[PDB]
């Protein structure tokens, strides 16, 4: 029964404003820098842009600690700039999604400033304030960003709750006044015409009644305890009923800490909650659930089995986003491909083909379209992210893990690998800034930059452009049902996308050797749609493919 919508068949691009384009030489990207480059994104073929938080913030967590929801970040520009970004996008038929961060505010936000003044302030129970127990915190909750999730306040002697930085106190959603104020805030932005909202850590809004301690076992996977709040779907559905269902918008849910088997309740269209699932299963398939900075080896069979299970779980009534990287994860060509110079461009084109042939709304993160890589961080001070500093404090400063072993993992897992500034050209600081970038630019910018690619028809950029054109032209690549040809194959990832008689096959060789691959059953090729790194001709009725290393392709199959 499912209906097409613009957001199901959109190709989104994600801009992290702080690292996209600086137009005033302070080293920090800003809104004018986005506006300046809308034609570049239109040329790529992007339907909609999701921007990370753009609100007044002290930047403990680069926009995710909001000091005033109705004001533009000072480093990003003014309200007039933000309105111009909407206006200039609208002229180009591009839709804007903004990031909604309402699990918590900055500890500088006026509500918290008031809350913390005494048990008595009308804003006290806007946040969570509990007595200590035995001269320590109210319970054994840890924070995602290091140490205890409870911060002592010497004035009152109680502690306040912060799942994330102590500068990110959690809002009390159990207070209907808090929920009402947040809805008013959402209407202020929605009335400006924004087309989409992405809800940061949407699954933590409901806290566990009476805050009991976590078990020893729970402490090793605590995020999954924080998403078990008994009213979470009541609150998300109330927000849908009172606000979301009043605008023509697309809503995405970042369901951090939600196991896949509890995800469909946020996205089933019958439930009137949210529209698009942002899950962590694939992008962190190789991350430890306890030591969340640690990675382990992974295989293509592990990867594809997660793709399939994520696809199955959305089923008839939910809907997924699909992304291999974003501002919270290492770059896709490094993590999932081979970023050495022999292979980088082929592997980036193969992961683009994978991304843009999923039954999901694809999100392209800034710079993935050039094949940008992870950055060669050497020492702990080369990073800037609050989260990596919290993991260092919890695991290296306690002597639990050697500094060098920790660094070998966070070089591969740090959020900062995707935050080095966008590589526009081969000029100084890759054309990102006339001043000093806030985070050092990868020296590979001389090889990997947009200017070198945009007019080269063989570039990663133009392969993405072609794939997006192909996706927009073939309905089965958006809405077709997905079948993995062999979930246990660790060499060649092959799967079909089917709408009625229209059946297409995607084949990607993840090996760096030639692989012969014979199709199953009676499948045979009707025609080639696109290939990268092919050295062979594929004809009507062919049943076998010779795949060069990192070869990728889309084919239409015979009925
Ligand atoms: Ca700037």
Author numbering: 42 to 600
Q: Anything the authors wrote about it?
A:
SIases, classified as glycoside hydrolase family 13 (GH13) enzymes, catalyze the isomerization of sucrose to produce isomaltulose and trehalulose as primary products and D-glucose and D-fructose as by-products. NX-5 (named NX-5 in this work) that predominantly produces isomaltulose (~87%). Similar to other GH13 family enzymes, the NX-5 molecule is composed of three domains: the N-domain (residues 42-145 and 216-520), the sub-domain (residues 146-215), and the C-domain (residues 521-600). Among them, residues Asp102, His145, Arg239, His368, Asp369, Glu428, and Arg456 are responsible for sucrose binding and residues Asp241 (the nucleophile) and Glu295 (the acid catalyst) are crucial for sucrose hydrolysis for PalI, MutB, and SmuA.
Crystals of NX-5 diffracted to 1.70 Å resolution and belonged to the space group P2 12 121, with unit-cell parameters a = 58.9 Å, b = 81.3 Å, c = 138.0 Å. There is one molecule in the asymmetric unit of the crystal lattice. The final model included residues 42-600 of NX-5 and two glycerol molecules while the electron density for the C-terminal His-tag was not visible. A hexa-coordinate magnesium ion was found to interact with five residues (Asp63, Asn65, Asp67, Ile69, and Asp71) highly conserved in all known SIases. In the NX-5 structure, the magnesium ion was about 23 Å away from the active site pocket, suggesting its function may be structural rather than catalytic. The active site of NX-5 is located in a pocket that is approximately 25 Å deep from the negatively charged surface. Similar to the function of the corresponding residues Phe256/Phe270 and Phe280/Phe294 in MutB/SmuA, Phe297 and Phe321 in NX-5 form an aromatic clamp near the entrance of the active pocket. Superimposition of 15 residues (Asp102, His145, Gln209, Arg239, Ala241, Glu295, Phe297, Phe321, Arg325, Arg328, Arg333, His368, Asp369, Glu428 and Arg456) in the substrate-binding pocket of the native NX-5, the E295Q/sucrose complex and the D241A/glucose complex show subtle structural changes in the active site pocket with an RMSD of 0.20 Å between the native NX-5 and the E295Q/sucrose complex and an RMSD of 0.15 Å between the native NX-5 and the D241A/glucose complex.
